[PDB]
Design a protein around this ligand. Structure first.
Ligand SMILES: Nc1ncnc2c1ncn2[C@@H]1O[C@H](COP(=O)(O)OP(=O)(O)O)[C@@H](O)[C@H]1O
Ligand code: BEF
Ligand SMILES: [Mg+2]
Length: 799
């Protein structure tokens, strides 16, 4: 699949070595190649070419540091390949370089291929590989850029990466979950691959930490800058444009704040100091960014503008803020949003050159803060904040919030300029803020739920989790890992012996959290993909409903209207999403009337539509669907059955179950984990007193003191029975009852418990046979074993 380049055999031969050597000499007479080499010789890395190659040749692991844009990503790979070609051994090269994101892997590969007077892929020297998309280069003497997630998937097919001669772990400052796992796997692989060469590269790095981690491996610094970059703090921004607005470290900030303002009045005008005093540290001043953008386009020379915002809500707000002005309405400006949830085609448009009289303005998240080179970028506006997930060990609650940027992220955002020409960087934090920023972000493995971490360790068969944790550079706490083990058992991704179930194997192959992975997996298995992908897309990210001030009464009445009789916050999103798609088919003006009428965000809805395509791609690579279309008729035979959908929701939401108590009109809700809870007023089941079932499933909790259920749907006890935990038959002599996880009790014939035990087992056999060669369930086949098992589960859910 995505392992076509890996499963080749590194077979060097002298005949190809001679062809590559002759091809290099013919390139040296090609005008397009010669002009590219003229630019390459100007890079700081070109002076270090002999030193870098000689050091990588004499040591197995090498740490390379250098200023942003000095040439690490695009030149080091070429230095290794061209050195082998000139030595008559070019075919022995199989260089793989990792990039943290798909936009980095694609654009860098296109750039390197262009620097070598070649097209990307097509059996040339350079190509790329990402999820379900690749331009593969030739077999021998080639360079392949790819995402770190591709290498992790490669380890499932070849844990030794046998055909790879050089692996380059690039942008290692992005200490994400997958990068830390891959780095620890490579370290263990060194002794088993004495012929392998490993290179570690970043611009903002505690290099000594990485060298010591890799057995005191040698370090090499690439000195020099490509182009200067002017840096501006908040005081410098307000002074230049004359802008007037129309936990313990904060105690240090408040303590030094009055003296800082006094020292600031001696270096800046009193008006700007007053503006600095009333600036808000809670959120990014989008009015200030827009005023700075206006100053750049009206007073400064030509050059694209790149803006860094924490999330999607900030990007769309600033975009509407600029588009509401006459100046940015015209075609002299092209405003391009950039979000990770966008299709890859939309992300690449940022690299397209603009007409000479047209100014490009890119509004991006941290997706654009590393690696990528945008040609015309001269001005970088750093909002100073970045979305970060945070996890508390005491209570199972994870929060996404806009946090102050670290010094490393700021240097990477500043690094997006000064690559092809001089630049300017404006940081929206004051000097006192700068002195209190951390050097680096906390590694994601130290501040997020670790269910994906544990699934990743188990799928690679790296031995016990305890041993692998001790080998990580920054190991998480054992209490956080045990909580993940408990959650994975309740999801039935791990059995009682902490071993992967068949379901857990497929969840480990899905690059999302297992709760979402389990929901989208059974949506494909039960042929209700489109409504389930919509629900999953809204559980991640956010729901499309908005509530203006004073409009709470009318907005609630709209939501209860869209819910019909489903008693389901998640089926309400489906109906709101479907009604939105039907309004788009009507027209653009009537689509806006629909969103305003029901208080729906067209921006959020469009983002949910993009997430649905990304979820379908994950299931496509996993082999559970046959196309990238979330509305493919193959996977939507049961998409208009409310009961099957609600079961798939329950499949993903368990064990987040709530029990309803009615008193003859009072309704009380209990969740076992936190006891009594209430229903959040935004939900559709707030004033509900008539329930067909006494059980709810939820996804989001809020406290807010007394626990509130953000989104909940009523669910049948037979959905909790099948997708639940342990099943026990309780005998009261007077009568028998069935229990799920002891507390979920309901009157039911005891033989149903035996049926569920047998149907769960057949589901495991179905998923087991899907492991070796995944194939979507052919629901057209009435007399098939896979459909018979799934039909029996469906009949149990319906009755
Ligand atoms: N798409 C491109 N168009 C023009 N120049 C580019 C492009 N990509 C890279 N470059 C030039 O090549 C240099 C090397 O970039 P890169 O190797 O990514 O630097 P680093 O790895 O040190 O961040 C950049 O400074 C830039 O000037
Ligand atoms: F160091 Be480069 F900007 F990736
Ligand atoms: Mg780089």
């Amino acid at each position: 699949r995505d392992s076509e380049y890996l499963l080749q055999e590194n077979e060097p031969d002298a005949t190809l070595d001679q062809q590559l050597l002759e091809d290099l000499q013919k390139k040296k007479t090609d005008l397009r190649y010669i002009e590219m080499q003229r630019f390459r010789e100007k890079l700081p890395s070109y002076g270090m070419q002999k030193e870098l190659v000689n050091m990588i040749d004499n040591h197995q692991v090498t740490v390379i540091s250098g200023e942003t844009g000095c040439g690490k990503t695009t030149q080091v790979t070429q230095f290794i390949l061209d050195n082998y070609i000139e030595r008559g051994k070019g075919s022995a090269c199989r260089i793989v370089c990792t990039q943290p994101r798909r936009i980095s892997a694609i654009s860098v590969a296109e750039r390197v291929a262009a620097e070598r007077a070649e097209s990307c892929g097509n059996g040339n020297s350079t190509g790329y590989q990402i999820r379900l998309q690749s331009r593969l280069p030739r077999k021998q003497g080639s360079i392949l850029y790819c995402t770190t997630g591709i290498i992790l998937q490669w380890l499932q097919s070849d844990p030794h990466l046998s055909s790879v001669s050089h692996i380059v772990l690039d942008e290692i400052h992005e200490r994400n979950l997958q990068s830390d796992v891959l780095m620890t796997v490579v370290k263990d692989l060194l002794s088993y691959r004495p012929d392998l060469k490993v290179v570690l590269m970043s611009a903002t790095l505690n290099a000594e930490k990485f060298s010591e981690y890799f057995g005191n491996c040698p370090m090499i610094h690439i000195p020099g800058f490509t182009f200067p970059v002017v840096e501006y703090l908040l005081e410098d921004i307000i002074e230049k444009i004359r802008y007037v607005p129309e936990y313990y470290y904060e105690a240090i900030y408040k303590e030094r704040w009055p003296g800082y303002l006094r020292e600031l009045r001696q270096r800046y005008s009193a008006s700007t100091v007053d503006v600095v005093e009333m600036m808000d540290d809670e959120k990014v001043d989008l009015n200030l960014i827009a005023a700075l953008i206006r100053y750049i386009v009206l007073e400064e020379e030509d050059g694209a503008i790149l803006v860094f915002l924490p999330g999607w809500d900030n990007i769309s707000t600033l975009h509407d803020l600029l588009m509401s002005q006459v100046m940015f309405k015209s075609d002299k400006f092209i405003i391009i949003p950039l979000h990770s949830l966008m299709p890859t085609v939309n992300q690449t448009q940022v690299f397209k050159r603009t007409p000479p009289g047209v100014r490009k303005i890119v509004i991006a998240t941290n997706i654009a803060e590393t690696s990528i080179t945008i040609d015309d970028v001269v001005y970088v506006i750093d909002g100073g904040k970045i979305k970060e997930t945070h996890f508390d060990t005491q209570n199972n609650i994870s929060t996404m919030s806009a946090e102050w940027v670290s010094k490393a992220n700021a240097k990477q955002r500043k690094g997006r300029a000064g690559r092809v020409q001089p630049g300017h960087c404006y940081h929206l934090y004051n000097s006192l803020r700068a002195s209190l920023l951390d050097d680096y972000q906390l590694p994601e493995i130290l501040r997020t739920p670790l269910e994906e971490l544990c699934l990743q360790i188990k799928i690679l068969r790296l031995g016990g989790i305890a041993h692998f944790l001790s080998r990580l550079m920054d190991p998480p706490s054992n209490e956080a890992v045990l909580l993940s083990i408990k959650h994975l058992m309740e999801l039935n991704a791990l059995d009682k012996q902490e071993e992967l179930t068949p379901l857990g194997v497929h969840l480990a192959r899905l690059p999302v959290e297992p709760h979402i992975g389990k929901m989208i997996l059974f949506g494909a298995l039960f042929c209700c993909l489109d409504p389930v992908l919509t629900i999953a897309a809204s559980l991640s990210f956010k729901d499309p409903f908005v509530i203006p001030l004073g409009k709470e009464k009318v907005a609630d009445a709209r939501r209860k209207e869209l819910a019909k009789d489903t008693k389901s916050d998640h089926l309400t999103v489906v109906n709101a999403f479907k009604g939105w798609e039907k309004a788009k088919q009507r027209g653009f003006r009537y689509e806006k009337d629909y969103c305003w009428e029901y208080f729906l965000s067209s921006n959020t809805l469009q983002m949910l539509h993009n997430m649905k395509g990304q979820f379908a791609e994950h299931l496509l690579g996993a082999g559970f669907v046959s196309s990238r279309n979330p509305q493919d008729p193959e996977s939507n035979i049961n998409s208009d059955n409310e009961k099957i959908i609600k079961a798939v929701i329950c499949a993903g939401l368990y064990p987040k179950v709530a029990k309803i108590r009615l008193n003859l009109k009072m309704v009380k809700v209990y969740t076992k984990t936190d006891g009594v809870v209430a229903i959040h007023p935004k939900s559709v089941n707030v004033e509900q007193t008539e329930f067909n079932y006494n059980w709810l499933i939820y996804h989001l909790k809020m406290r807010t003191s007394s626990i509130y259920l953000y989104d909940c749907t009523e669910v049948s006890p037979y959905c909790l029975l099948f997708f639940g935990g342990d099943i026990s038959i309780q005998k009261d002599n007077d009568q028998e009852t069935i229990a799920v996880d002891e507390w979920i009790i309901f009157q039911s014939p005891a033989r149903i418990a035996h049926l569920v035990k047998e149907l769960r087992k057949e589901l495991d056999i179905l998923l087991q046979e899907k492991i070796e060669s995944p194939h979507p369930v052919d629901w057209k086949d009435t007399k098939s074993r896979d459909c018979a098992v799934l039909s029996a589960i469906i009949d149990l859910i319906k009755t």
